[PDB]
Design a protein around this ligand. Structure first.
Ligand code: HEM
Ligand SMILES: [Xe]
Ligand SMILES: [Xe]
Length: 137
């Protein structure tokens, strides 16, 4: 279930964080624009830029932490609050997160792995509802 999936992702954080982020950029290519330094580079070319692996791992670490403090896939208001008020996210709308989670759920379903994708679906939706209640456009 969702709790096992957190263990799974944590177990190989770097690999899942890169594979899922690239699935996101690839499914929704106009999102690359928020990441100036990843414009014009292949999947393999990005995996040797130091900040790409740093960034992806830190994003999914934090995502995993938020996932963990959630109850029944409902995130803490204060976690939602940190995602709105972070400098890096000032330009973002909830539409951006919707996309990440649609790419994340699509990744899970495509893997041969028994992820609880429905639960990740719910979590993404609940995180988007909480981002808005917390003030994100
Ligand atoms: C739950 C999902 C997300 C989490 C947990 C998250 C978290 C983070 C974290 C932790 C960083 C800083 C990494 C570091 O210190 O090196 C970051 C930066 C950033 N985020 Fe997110 N984010 C999420 C979703 C998104 C989405 C959906 C977008 C746009 C589509 C986005 C855009 C950015 C950009 C452009 C940066 C700047 C890169 C950097 O500072 O390294 N984030 N985010
Ligand atoms: Xe992201
Ligand atoms: Xe957070």
């Amino acid at each position: 279930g969702f709790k096992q999936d957190i263990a799974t992702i944590r177990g190989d954080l770097r690999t899942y964080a890169q594979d899922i982020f690239l699935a996101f950029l690839n499914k929704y290519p106009d999102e690359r624009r928020y990441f100036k330094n990843y414009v014009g580079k292949s999947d393999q070319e990005l995996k040797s830029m130091a900040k790409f692996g740093d960034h992806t791992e830190k994003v999914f670490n934090l995502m995993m932490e938020v996932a963990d403090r959630a109850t029944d896939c409902v995130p803490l208001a204060s976690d939602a609050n940190t995602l709105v008020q972070m400098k890096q996210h000032s330009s973002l709308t909830t539409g951006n997160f919707e996309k990440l989670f649609v790419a994340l759920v699509e990744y899970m379903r495509a893997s041969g792995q028994s992820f609880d994708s429905q639960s990740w679906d719910r979590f993404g939706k609940n995180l988007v509802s909480a981002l808005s209640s917390a003030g994100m456009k």
